[PDB]
Design a protein around this ligand. Sequence first.
Ligand code: NI
Ligand code: NI
Lengths: 44, 40, 40, 45
Amino acid sequence: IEKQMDRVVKEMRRQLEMIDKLTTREIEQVELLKRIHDKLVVQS
Amino acid sequence: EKQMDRVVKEMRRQLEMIDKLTTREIEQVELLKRIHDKLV
Amino acid sequence: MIEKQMDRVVKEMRRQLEMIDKLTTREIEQVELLKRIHDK
Amino acid sequence: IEKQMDRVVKEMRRQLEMIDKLTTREIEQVELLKRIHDKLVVQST
Ligand code: NI
Ligand code: NI
């Protein structure tokens, strides 16, 4: 019972880290896209 | 000239494609944050 | 999700993002050149 | 008659210009709402 809980808890913590890394990387990609967008807005 | 006007029109179309890309990426981030909050 | 599958998709988007930056940079340069020649 | 049609068409063109002005404002309103929405998302992470 304790061993099952630690397996589930360890799996959740791994998914929280992967979710954190994917959201961080997508936010940076969005920021980059917005900079390109703003360069296009002015230059057009 | 016509070549300059064509490229300006292409840039405006690309602004629309970038907007769709940022909207989808932002919405994916919102979902991921909602999933994450289920657990914390 | 698996970390290797997530890194594959993210790195591919980053590569496509760099191509969008280079292509829009070239498009900005084209408008600048066309205006400079036309302005003479 | 041709003169009646010219009056009607000129009036229709005036209404199309009002749609143009409304669309210009709608462009800004949609852009502002999207920028605010996206900033709220990013800040909340
Ligand atoms: Ni987290
Ligand atoms: Ni939203």
